[PDB]
Amino acid sequence: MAGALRLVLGDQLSDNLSALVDADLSRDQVLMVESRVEATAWKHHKQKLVLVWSAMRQFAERLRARGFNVRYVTLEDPDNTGSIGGELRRALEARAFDRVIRTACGKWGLESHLLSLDLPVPMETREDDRFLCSRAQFAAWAEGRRELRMEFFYREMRRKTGLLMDGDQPAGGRWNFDAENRRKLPPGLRPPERLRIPPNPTTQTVLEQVSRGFDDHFGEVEGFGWPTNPDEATAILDHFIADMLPSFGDWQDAMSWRRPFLWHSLISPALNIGLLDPLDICRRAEAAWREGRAPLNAVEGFIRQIIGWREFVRGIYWLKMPEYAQRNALDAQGKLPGFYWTGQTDMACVADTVRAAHDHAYAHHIQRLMVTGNLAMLLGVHPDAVDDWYMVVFADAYEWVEMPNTRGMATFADGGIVGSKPYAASGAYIDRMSDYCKGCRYDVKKRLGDDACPFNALYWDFIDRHAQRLAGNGRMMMPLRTLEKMPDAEREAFRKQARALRVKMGVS
């Protein structure tokens, strides 16, 4: 008869959050905290701080307008303890409560902490059911599988959700329409201009606080164009579905110099904090095919990324922590080159990717995978140091998605749990998929010398370094026989060049 305290964290900004469902407005209180612990665990991009705190304050006001009683603690409050647990206690001290109700969060370490808290009232923890597959459902699907393959989990999610399903058949007779026949942009095709969101009043206010109080943090705040509330988020989605979706998948893997968005949806920072719903997004993409406004190959490619990849990696994260975060399968011990932070390198592809991280707190998937992720693998950078960079630079960054993608798909530090094979590549891939190398001072045709592209000698040194480990999986066969036909004086030459590059780059 004292009511409940309902905690809401900065990535839980949904009216349908499980902790808010079943609220008694006359008795309960909602707790929302701007936490310097969370905001400095990594020194997150200036644009991530603005996004989350702008969204939080606006989410708080919408709650108040519905009759909710909201205890909102700002980062300028001088009694703010700084932490979620500290502010839980101080709130329970301020009035009587029957219990604390919360929704499981997206960081194993913080989830583990809150479950252990000694509190003077009971605490109920509810599954986050905004996701389409629960933690328990994933564990059940994975039980007894020797390896975990996304394609098979994706078929399960199509049947469970009914997306692109005509009865019990996949639409168009096939599950997947991905063709390995994709290419760079035509020279005359300029990519469209994307809708950016000018800052509303609340967002402007938080941008000034962040520019003064968090100046030591990575990235530029000028140009902030991310959506901070469901109306702004819905406008982004509308623009993607109407103008971009029909050409999605034609260009999902292309890269173009100083055009950082291309035809991608740019929804991840909003989806990851609750401003959009995964199911609603997919249903509006399906209806676009159903009504003749987009081709099926483009709509399936997009839906695959959300009910397939995004659900798959979260499942892996919760199934395999806390040990997943400690695996270093290739014994990588190198340091991270400084140009990851500064962008000061003559490799035009790396430089363009870091520039986008700095200026927009965003780069698109193939750059995260095949440029900065691939490079870190080949250089042999310690995965702890790669995780720290990815968690800093991107506006969408959370551990449950960053880890399996970075420590798994991009760098094989998990030994193939998420992907199935190292996604290693030489400069020839980047040249095929981009317009970068023509403007690069390096020569993508050469492997040795001071003008050679660093990806070429490094690729082969990586293959040579791990030839034996990679021999036992079986999807790496072409590169191994090609290494096998290499005379020894040819191998020694690239081993020497790759060694030279690691010193040059400040890795070892």
Q: Which DSSP category does 363 fall into?
A: -
Q: From ligand SF4, ligand FAD, ligand DLZ, none, which one binds at residue 267 (CB under 5 to 8 Å depending on kind)?
A: ligand FAD
The answer on whether 508 is annotated among ligand-binding residues is: no
- What, of ligand FAD, ligand DLZ, ligand SF4, none, does residue 309 touch, CB below 5 to 8 Å by kind? ligand FAD
Query: CB–CB of 6/52 below 8 Å?
Result: no
CA distance to 309, 318, 324, 330, 419, per residue, from 321 (Å): 18, 6, 5, 19, 17
Nearest to 260 by CA among 201, 305, 194, 340: 194
State in angstroms the smallest separation of the CB of 12 from ligand DLZ: 7
Cα separation, 89 vs 119, in Å, equals 7
**Smaller CB distance to ligand FAD: residue 305 or 497?**
305
* Residue 409 binds to ligand FAD (criterion: CB under 6 A): yes
- Picked from ligand DLZ, ligand SF4, ligand FAD, none, the partner binding residue 266 (CB below 5 to 8 A depending on kind) is ligand FAD
44 binds, among ligand SF4, ligand DLZ, ligand FAD, none (CB under 5 to 8 A by kind): ligand DLZ
168 CB neighbour count, 10 Å cutoff: 7
| Window of 59-67, 309-317, 436-444, 480-488 that interacts with ligand FAD by CB under 6 A | 309-317
The verdict on whether residue 252 carries a ligand-binding annotation is yes
| Closest listed residue to residue 103, CA positions, set 15, 209, 234 | 15
Work out whether 394 is an interface residue with ligand FAD (CB under 6 A): yes
Stretch that binds ligand SF4, among 71-79, 323-331, 341-349, 408-416 (CB under 6 A): 341-349
**What part of residues 58-97 is at the interface with ligand SF4 (CB under 6 A)?**
none
Sorted by sequence, the CB contacts under 8 Å of residue 103 that are 6+ apart come out as: 7, 8, 9, 12, 17, 18, 19, 125, 126, 127, 128
Interaction pattern, residues 91-120, with ligand DLZ; x per rule: CB under 6 A: --------------xxx-------------
* Angle in degrees, 0-180, between the axes of helices 108-116 and 84-94, rounded to the nearest 10: 30
According to DSSP, the β-strands at 29-33 and 123-126 are unpaired
Residue closest to 32 by CA, chosen among 3, 69, 79, 1: 69
Between residues 317 and 436, which has the closer beta carbon with respect to ligand SF4? Answer: 436
Q: Does 410 bind ligand FAD (CB under 6 A)?
A: yes
Residue 4 exposed, middle or buried by CB count within 10 Å (0-12, 13-18, 19+): buried
Residue 10 contact among ligand SF4, ligand DLZ, ligand FAD, none, beta carbon within 5 to 8 Å by kind = ligand DLZ
What is the residue-wise DSSP string for 63-93?
HHHTT--EEEE-TT-TT--SSHHHHHHHHHH
Smallest CA-to-CA distance from 317 within 157, 106, 156, 11 is with: 106
User: Under a CB-based contact definition with an 8 Å cutoff, are residues 247 and 265 in contact?
Assistant: no
Pick one of ligand DLZ, ligand SF4, ligand FAD, none as the site partner of residue 410 (Cβ within 5 to 8 A by kind): ligand FAD
387 binds ligand DLZ (CB under 6 A): no
Q: Is residue 431 part of the contact set for ligand DLZ (CB under 6 A)?
A: no
Residue 390 marked in a binding site: no
Q: Which amino acid is at 339?
A: F
Stretch that binds ligand FAD, among 303-311, 336-344, 479-487, 498-506 (CB under 6 A): 303-311
CB of 452 to ligand SF4, least distance (A): 9
44 near ligand DLZ, rule: CB under 6 A: yes
Residue 381 DSSP label: B
Q: Would you count residue 45 as binding ligand FAD (CB under 6 A)?
A: no
Tokens linked to 101? 């109700």
Nearest one of 431, 337, 439 to 378, comparing CA atoms? 337
Using CB under 6 A as the binding rule, the residues of this chain from 389 to 418 that contact ligand DLZ are 398
Q: Which residue number is nearest to ligand FAD in terms of Cβ?
A: 265
Report long-range pairs for 51-54 (Cβ below 8 Å, ≥24 apart).
51/226, 51/228, 51/269, 51/273, 51/395, 52/10, 52/11, 52/273, 53/10, 53/206, 53/210, 54/199, 54/200, 54/202, 54/203, 54/206, 54/207, 54/228
Binding-site residues for FAD, in ranges, read 252, 264-268, 272, 362, 365, 368, 396, 405
Question: Which residues make up the interface to ligand DLZ (CB under 6 A)?
Answer: 9-11, 33-35, 38-39, 44, 48-49, 52, 105-107, 398
Question: Which residues make up the interface to ligand FAD (CB under 6 A)?
Answer: 264-268, 271-272, 305-306, 309-310, 313, 364-365, 368-369, 373, 390, 394, 396-397, 401-402, 405-406, 409-410
Binding-site residues, in ranges, read 10-11, 33, 35, 38, 53, 106, 252, 264-268, 272, 349, 362, 365, 368, 396, 405, 437, 440, 453
Question: Which residues make up the interface to ligand SF4 (CB under 6 A)?
Answer: 347-349, 427, 430-431, 436-437, 440, 442, 444, 453, 455
